[PDB]
C-alpha cells in the first residue's frame, strides 16, 4: 500500500509504502515528478503538483524501502515501476521524499 503523512491534507505529505510487512519511506536521491505522478495516481488523485526532497514533511521512521526507482509516469502504482532492489542503505530519514498531489 501507499499513504501520505504529515501534510496539510491527505493530498500531500511524506510518501510511505508498505512492503515486507513494514511501513517504510522513500529516499529522495532519484525522486522526481514522474514517480510522484505514479504515486498520486495510485492514491486516486488526477496528477502531481510538486515533489519535495529532504524530509519536507518531516522524517519518517523504520525501513527506507525505495531509492533507485524508475517510472515512465503512467504506471498504476509504484510497485509497477522499475525497482532493482527493495530496502536501501544509502539514505537517512532526513531524505524522506514527499509529494503534493492535485485533487
Ligand atoms: Ca539525498
Swiss-Prot record:
Residues 2-102 form the SRCR domain. Signal peptide: none annotated. Changing residue 93 to R: Found in patients with prostate cancer. It comes from the Eukaryota. Disulfide bonds join 27-91, 40-101, 71-81. Isoform I, isoform II and isoform III are expressed in monocyte-derived macrophages. Isoform I and isoform II are expressed in the liver, placenta and brain. It is found in: Membrane. Changing residue 21 to S: Found in a family with prostate cancer. Homotrimer. Interacts with MYO18A. Membrane glycoproteins implicated in the pathologic deposition of cholesterol in arterial walls during atherogenesis. Two types of receptor subunits exist. These receptors mediate the endocytosis of a diverse group of macromolecules, including modified low density lipoproteins (LDL). Isoform III does not internalize acetylated LDL. It is linked to Prostate cancer: A malignancy originating in tissues of the prostate. Most prostate cancers are adenocarcinomas that develop in the acini of the prostatic ducts. Other rare histopathologic types of prostate cancer that occur in approximately 5% of patients include small cell carcinoma, mucinous carcinoma, prostatic ductal carcinoma, transitional cell carcinoma, squamous cell carcinoma, basal cell carcinoma, adenoid cystic carcinoma (basaloid), signet-ring cell carcinoma and neuroendocrine carcinoma. Barrett esophagus: A condition characterized by a metaplastic change in which normal esophageal squamous epithelium is replaced by a columnar and intestinal-type epithelium. Patients with Barrett esophagus have an increased risk of esophageal adenocarcinoma. The main cause of Barrett esophagus is gastroesophageal reflux. The retrograde movement of acid and bile salts from the stomach into the esophagus causes prolonged injury to the esophageal epithelium and induces chronic esophagitis, which in turn is believed to trigger the pathologic changes. This is Macrophage scavenger receptor types I and II. It comes from Homo sapiens (Human). The chain holds residues 349 to 451 of 451 of the full protein.
